[PDB]
Amino acid sequence: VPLPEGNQLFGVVEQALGAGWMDVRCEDGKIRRCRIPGKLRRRVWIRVGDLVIVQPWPVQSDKRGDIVYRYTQTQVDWLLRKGKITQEFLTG
């Protein structure tokens, strides 16, 4: 239901680097080493290959970012019906 705002955009989880760090491919072609904020790190489990909202850092907004929201399967289908996400983006 929430949508990206400003620098926020859609991303796909690619690899888990441990220590609360993730690898996420964005919808423009940049692989970013993102950090999981503690507020949502203690509530929601996240696996490899999920759609999330990536907010770039105010400094060096090219390789580092944060993950601020994750969607569910029903939300993924709803976005697919709306026309905001495509099969190519899911499959990379």
Partner 1 sequence: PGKKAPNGEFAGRKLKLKRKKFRWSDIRYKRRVLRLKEKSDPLEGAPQARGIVLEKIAVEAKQPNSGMRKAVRVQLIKNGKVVTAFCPGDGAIKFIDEHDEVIIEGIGGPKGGSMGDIPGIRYKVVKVNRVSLKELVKGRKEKPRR
Q: 38 or 92: whose CB is closer to partner 1?
A: 38
Assess 45 for contact with RNA (CB under 7 A): no
Q: What residues contact residue 23 under an 8 Å CB cut-off, 6+ apart?
A: 13, 14, 15, 16, 17, 31, 32, 33, 34
Assess 6 for contact with RNA (CB under 7 A): no
CA gap 12, 2 in Å, rounded:
16
Q: 38 or 58: whose CB is closer to RNA?
A: 38
41-80 footprint of partner 1 as x/- string (CB under 8 A): -x----------------x---------------------
CA gap 50, 33 in Å, rounded:
15
